[PDB]
Each structure stands twice: as structure tokens, then as C-alpha cells.
């Protein structure tokens, strides 16, 4: 159904892995199509132009020579309406880059170690979720520079948190990690909505109180029964979950029996599997799939440079798959990203190469 052609490739000069890539879906229509890549101590912006051109725009290089960025995510600046780019990695410091000036305008220290993923809330562009090697997720309000909530502890993850996603409504989060667990954390309670409201009301110039963070010790659901090894990428599909480990499949599943997501309580003993998307040669961890804006297609690169794209417009057992290869793309693909209009798919690799695929 979906066919793409490889129109160009570029390599960055640092020769370190590109761990992350994201198109800016928060651009204004008319704007050129821009994406960010992170690896080494760098964040780089590129624009896609005609005849396959991947045009270097500008870059931020961290003053710390031994920082290594792993992940980025785009949002809006609440003060101006223009885009912002959050980055983080091995140092465990969230940096908010203003992509206009390519300077760091805010940074957040708090995590005990490396940050593995960053996500923005789908309804509220100020609300940043980070997940960490310290076993916790944190929710920040980047307008008032406040830590709203820490998700961790008693029934929190017991090893590094590797990925998380908000659902479409931004009512709940699914996280996953090295403890081969997936954990659901609701954020639409009265308490949590009040906490977010208070975070906006906070101004340290008018008071000496600190801002009180919520400490959430108990997920609303937890399972270790989907995957056996490190779970490194999770994404909601409506009320269902897509997740993968290092076992060469993405599993489509739901908490409960074949059960309303919103009646699910922590005593739920079970899960239902609805389908799987099988592939090969993706058995190292920190390998992420993406979806298009409409969540009609799912793309994942593997450790030998193959790029799988599934048409999810289907019973998942029956989903059709396009395999995209190029004779010169042999290095491990860490992450992919579709343009907002789905016309372009970019893949980034361990050898610092970037691969541009255009929809036919």
C-alpha cells in the first residue's frame, strides 16, 4: 500500500550514533519541513527541500564536551507561540533549546542519572514528561519551571525507565523499562488536575513556599507478562498499547480481558494480546518505532539498516508490511520520524548517517 523511495543521505561529522530524530509538527503551515537529530553533544536542525535536499540549518553544541544527548521532543513556547526543542541524555539534565537562536533557555536538574526519553503532553505544550535511568518518570511545567509530579518508588519501576507515552487525551501515561514491566499512571484525577492548575499559579517572586510535587508510588496497572526482556518503546494506539522488547516483535495488547481501560485497577491480574508485528535483526535495545500523525502506519528500523513500515488500517494479524532498503544503508537505525503530512520518512543511524525516504 505505502511505497517510498530513498532520495538522499547525509552523514554528520562527529561519527557517533544519532540516537534520536523528530520532525517539528509544531511548525506553522507554509514553513519548510524541519527535523532535529541528537547524538554526540549536539542537536542539529535540517530542512527538507526539493530534489531530495537535506539542508543543514543550524546546530547547538553543548559546552560540556562529554554530554551525550539521547532524545529530543518539540513543543510551543507559551510566551511567543514559536517552537521549542527539549533535549536530554547521559548527564541527566533537560535542556530547552530555543531553535530560533539555538541557545539553551532553561534547564532542569533533578533526575539521579541519564534521561532516556522526553515527551510532551498532547493537550498542554508546557507539560514535559521525562524518564530516567534513576527508575522514575517526572512531569514538569516548563512555563513556571516547576516539577509537578514524580512517578516512582514502591510500585515504580525497579530498573531504568526507557520509554513512555501519553494517550491521545493526555489522561494517562504508559511507561516501560529494564525491569520488563509496563506501568500505567493516570493523570486525570482531581488531585493531579489540581496540581497542574497550581503549577500555573506558582511564582517564586511572590512567595517563599517551594512548589509541592506529587509523589505517585502506585501505578493504576502494572504487567510483566507481555515481554521477557528490556522494554524500550511504548506507544498508545487508542485504548490499546503497542510495545517492543529485544525479541523481534511489537506486541499489541490491552490491560484486562478482551474490559474498559478506565475501570482498570491495580489488582488487575491480566492482559489481552490482540496481535503482533514480527520482523528480524532488532535485538539490541534502544531501538524505537514511530507512527505517522494519523497513526495509520508504523515504522521501525533494525540493526542492519532495514526499515519496516506496516499499514495498520486493518485484526493486527493481517497487517501488511513494506520493507525499505538501500545497498549503502547497513548501520543500525535508532529512530525514525515521519513529516507531519506523511510525505517524508527520515531514519538515523549508529554511524551518524541520515536517510530520507519520500512517499511515491
Amino acid at each position: 500500500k505505502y511505497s517510498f523511495k530513498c532520495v538522499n543521505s547525509l552523514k554528520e561529522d562527529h561519527n557517533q550514533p544519532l540516537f534520536g530524530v523528530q520532525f517539528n509538527w509544531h511548525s506553522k503551515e507554509g514553513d519548510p519541513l524541519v527535523f532535529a537529530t541528537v547524538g554526540s553533544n549536539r542537536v542539529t536542525l535540517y530542512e527538507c527541500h526539493s530534489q531530495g535536499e537535506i539542508r543543514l540549518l543550524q546546530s547547538y553544541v553543548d559546552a560540556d564536551a562529554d554530554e551525550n544527548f539521547y532524545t529530543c521532543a518539540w513543543t510551543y513556547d507559551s510566551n511567543t507561540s514559536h517552537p521549542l526543542l527539549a533535549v536530554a541524555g547521559s548527564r541527566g539534565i533537560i535542556r530547552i533549546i530555543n531553535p530560533i537562536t539555538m541557545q539553551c533557555i532553561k534547564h532542569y536538574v533533578g533526575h539521579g542519572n541519564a534521561i532516556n526519553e522526553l515527551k510532551f503532553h498532547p493537550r498542554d505544550p508546557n507539560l514535559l514528561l521525562s524518564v530516567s535511568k534513576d527508575h522514575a518518570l517526572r512531569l514538569w511545567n516548563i512555563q513556571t519551571d516547576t516539577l509537578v509530579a514524580i512517578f516512582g518508588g514502591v510500585e515504580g519501576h525497579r530498573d531504568e525507565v526507557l520509554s513512555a507515552d501519553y494517550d491521545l487525551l493526555g489522561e494517562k501515561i504508559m511507561s516501560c523499562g529494564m525491569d520488563h514491566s509496563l506501568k500505567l499512571w493516570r493523570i486525570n484525577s482531581k488531585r493531579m488536575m489540581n496540581a497542574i492548575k497550581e503549577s500555573y499559579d506558582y511564582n517564586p517572586n511572590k512567595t517563599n513556599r517551594p512548589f509541592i510535587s506529587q509523589k505517585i508510588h502506585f501505578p493504576d496497572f502494572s504487567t510483566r507478562d507481555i515481554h521477557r526482556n528490556y522494554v524500550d518503546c511504548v506507544r498508545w494506539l487508542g485504548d490499546l498499547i503497542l510495545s517492543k522488547s529485544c525479541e523481534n516483535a511489537i506486541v499489541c495488547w490491552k490491560p484486562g480481558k478482551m474490559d474498559d481501560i478506565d475501570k482498570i485497577k491495580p489488582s488487575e491480574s491480566n492482559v489481552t494480546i490482540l496481535g503482533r508485528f514480527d520482523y528480524s535483526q532488532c535485538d539490541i535495545w534502544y531501538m524505537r518505532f514511530s507512527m505517522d500523525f494519523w497513526q495509520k502506519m508504523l515504522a521501525l528500523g533494525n540493526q542492519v539498516g532495514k526499515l519496516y513500515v506496516w499499514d495498520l488500517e486493518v485484526d493486527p494479524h493481517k497487517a501488511k508490511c513494506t520493507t525499505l532498503t538501500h545497498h549503502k544503508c547497513g548501520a543500525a537505525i535508532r529512530q525514525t520520524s515521519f513529516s507531519r503530512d506523511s510525505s517524508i520518512l527520515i531514519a538515523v543511524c549508529d554511524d551518524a548517517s541520515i536517510w530520507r525516504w519520500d512517499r511515491l
Binding site: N229, Y230, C246, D283, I284, W285, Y286, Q303, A332, D350
Partner: peptide, 5 residues
């Protein structure tokens, strides 16, 4: 498992 190939 391993992060690197």
C-alpha cells in the same frame, strides 16, 4: 541484553 552491535 546489549545496547550496541
Amino acid at each position: 541484553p546489549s545496547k550496541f552491535l
